[model samples]
Target: PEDWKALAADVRSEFQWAWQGYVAKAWGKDEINPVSGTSRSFFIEGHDLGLSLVEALDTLWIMGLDAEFQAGVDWVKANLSFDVDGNAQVFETNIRLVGGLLSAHLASGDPVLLAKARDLADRLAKAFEASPHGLPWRYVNLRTGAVSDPETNLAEIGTYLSEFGVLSQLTGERKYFDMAKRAMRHTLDRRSKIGLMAANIHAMTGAFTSRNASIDVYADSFYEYLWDAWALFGDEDCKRWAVECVDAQLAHQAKRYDGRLWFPMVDFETGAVTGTAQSELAAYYAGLLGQVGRKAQGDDYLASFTYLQATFGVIPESIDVTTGQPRRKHTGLRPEYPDACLNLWLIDRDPRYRRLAAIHYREMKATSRAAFGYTALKDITTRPMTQDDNCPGYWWSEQMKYYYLLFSDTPRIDYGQLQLSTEANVLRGFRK
Candidate 1:
């Protein structure tokens, strides 16, 4: 573990190259086409939210890229604004923008980032105010202050509590936590008689819209925040619900194949297996299970994904759990696998998890590293793995941040106190 110093340095150097690419070519934009060296907006149409910079601030600070971190803060203060004329995805904005800003505020003791977080929170709070059913609407019109998108996934409905709850604690405001907790309660109240939650729901009517339930996609962060809200705010209800939710996932969704635990999409009502596929996004549950004292099942689940990573170099977006074949064959430089690896490592201080992370960092550096930086792959099944133009916005926050922490024993982040949101922002620690 002593020589992990080298692995950690390698991780930071890769980050340096990717971040340099962002600052040089796509500064202040949502994402970069690393090959083309062009910029574009991702979440909202035609409006660049400066997402990459916001996402990178905490990462930069932790990496000791001081001037670059300050540059990110300066650019945000000068140009970043939420007053626009478009629909904002509530979950995405909350995690990446509000959570990211709050993390930087915590790291640097900067009041400007806190003010920005508060401003964005006020806009997003309107979604709950406009709600007809107890659950908040999914999208907000920032300029005109309108809420839309009555239908949303389970993740959308419940992912706000970690960031909102942190903001509530930091700002001494109860409304943020209250609004998010109400949404969480309403969502949990509608679970099936068997206690399984639906994948999608009607936000305006408090009704289940999808009979399929899985931890993989639409429902991942809902389960994550149930535990996170418990961890960050000591929410007793969330702690209870986290146990209940994961118990349902174990009893219904999870099954072992070739002695590995792989969760497939299941029918909410009957607990019958509906699909045999898994996504990288859902893989984060392994770490969640570890955190909740379900490490036996969690270890099996992590091994299932480690098998895939050993085969493909990078984890595929989606794969068939039954056949163990790539279903989508594409990769987006996802952080979930490495994130889980780091979390599991932190729990036991195991060197094997660190080695697993090393493989991931190597694959990302070898296959996805682009003209500007690391880009996504069109198909990892290809011999050389086809590269895409895009370096995902999350690459800055989730992927790099997770890998950096896994490799480096940085003094800037104390894992015991710091809380990482699903978006990879450290929102719940480093209190100023």
Candidate 2:
């Protein structure tokens, strides 16, 4: 198949514009927070480090942006540090830093990135040691190895298998893989009566703190890792767990309102709808379903999601399922929709998916792109443009990378051979 060269070129243009903005202003910072054009570090309070560069390194490599990629590598070696005096979310730090560095090292074969990944993981491993339950604490201090925030959601607890599992493979350390699998299995064993996982659990007791079965912020990535962990590592347990969860979703959580299908939050034990609101993050499941070979079901979701986008001309960050209206007017620069579109195109090869991607690309470019880079949308329906100063690192890691993949003639990374972490970090198979 010939590449969508024109679309690819346009996507590259948008990325370069944004990348140049970061280089000029937030070059050695965590992110641009585009509307304000300011920089801050996630780890060090007063230090300005190029966290975005680390996250974007693999994307640059994918696009053959060699000079920028090399510069990013140099910056990471010169400036990136985990020994700073700051507490970090265990999941966020692991995924962004550990996962990003591992993926970059895998692609570039840079031992420095691998060394950094191992050091960061070693510090983060404190979470596991600090907890009595198999689950780890939510936050950890990178320097002191002190863990805090004893309770964590399923999403955070179960999402780092790929990073840890892959790190184990890379460094010939079985502890990383063992710890990740233990945490995941512990969470799975505590599932509600209906085989649905709870939203929040205590790291000390493995007890459900908030037991709603949700596909939103708290529980989204649990299901994601179930499938992806199996795919990346050929774990039979993960496959079985993913299968059961999908069945539970089909049986209890799937909702149909006004002929459109959506997954609403449900009571974990009773299997009753608790919340009718869905977030943009859940949108990724549509593509995930298709990838798992549920084509008809996935397409049904694609159509339903298409309705949501067409209704507002842009998908809201959250929508009320019953009313089919925006639960929140604000829309963040999330990549889920485009990410789904890319997945659907890969699986179904439907021209409509491509058209949808183009529409979203234009909408984002027109609405979010700013003098600095890209800003969050305060209200997707507003005319004069209501922008949020926050520009998340994922705008480069997930959003632009998905766009690049959608139209590239030959993708440098093989999606079929790898299970993408929730943040879109590639996790390749290790069992051979």
Candidate 3:
């Protein structure tokens, strides 16, 4: 029941290190002393990381972070470079700008902020509707103001819709919500009859391009939205399908006798567990299970989380459930998607969950570079991957909002109580 203060300190330490190397290099000088007017920068890493940094530091209630948050928002607004300019990077405009503004407004309660958010949300909605496939294009030709690249992927589309739903609520707009629903519906309709959505779905026909599941398992954002939609609109159909699909997937979760979950890859058609890959995905679902009235299930899911915490002192991105060896280095943050586990933990107030989070903090201090900061390692065991980069992007929005609730709200995170930590933190804010 203690605040896991030690772990918190460790997580904080890792963040400090990461901030120094990853973020401090760019924003440090300007952030140290106030700069009057708005500034602009066009790097994806900057915008993405900037948004997450705001979310993370704000949740911590870190001193002087607001000015920095505002600066980051200003940077995106001014320097967000668009094509002559109908086309812009969907991720930056919607997730980074619109979503970030929504959170900023929520944090400060500014109507002006809300207006900007709504306008941006409207623009985003228009962009998607006019796209060739239900999926938005990945790139826009800046000079020509055209959607030159037709390539669309499931991961990005699903993730964006989740944010879209959130923006709709912050501004009290229905159109944004509608757009998100259509995007998700397009993806779901294309799911294999087995209820398994693949990595790539044909934009036009809503069919899978590869029979294999995507490593971007983060598309689980759609699953999160279904739950959000259900909570916001009393959309039982959405909730029902989400529950069914998640249950189906969880049912296939490969676990050792010790109680951890993994996914090598399930055969979309045969329901075969092709690979025995251990995953931290349980952390996401662990929180969801509790919020969805599966508290006991949520508690059980924590069994392995506890194991990882106790063994490594922090949660890694993935683990080898079979051997109890960490598949990758531990990174205290979740980058893949907005699973809202923190939201569920707020509901249950299960000390166990806090313990897991705390342990993660502690381990980062012990193992990773204090300078590099805490990164949710992409692949802990692979040579290609290292470091935790989860704290600096739009990815942190949902998790931080959920964390805000952990500090501000009581443990009753039911669907009916849609109090998000930030402005537009929860898409269900539109729910009556």
Highest-scoring model, lDDT: 1
RMSD of each: 1.5, 2.4, 6.3
Q: Write the per-residue lDDT of candidate 3 for residues 149-214, one digit (tens) a residue.
A: 444565556655455666655556667667667777776766667677766554444456666553
Poorest stretch of ten by lDDT in candidate 3:
30-39
Question: TM-score of predicted model 1?
Answer: 0.97
Clashes of each: 0, 1, 19
**Model 3: CA > 4 A from native:** 1-24, 28-93, 118-123, 130-133, 141-145, 148-153, 169-173, 213-218, 253-259, 320-322, 327-341, 367-391, 394-432
lDDT of each: 0.85, 0.80, 0.50
Q: For candidate 1, what is the lDDT?
A: 0.85
**lDDT pick, better of 1 and 2:** 1
Question: Which should have the higher TM-score, number 1 or number 3?
Answer: 1
Which regions of candidate 2 deviate over 4 angstroms? 1-3, 429-432
Q: Is candidate 1 or candidate 2 better by TM-score?
A: 1
Q: Candidate 3 local accuracy as lDDT?
A: 0.50
Model 3: lDDT of residue 181: 70
What are the per-residue Cα lDDT tens digits for candidate 1 across 1-432? 447888778778888888898889988889999988989897786789899899998989888888989999999989988888898988889988999998898899889889999999999988888876658788888877788888888888888998888889889999999999998888788788888988888877778888899897888888888888888888899999999999988888888877777889889999988888888887799899999889878888898889888887788798888888888977777889888987788788888887888888888878987888878888887788888889877888887778778777787776788788998888754533
Candidate 1 off by > 4 Å: 429-432
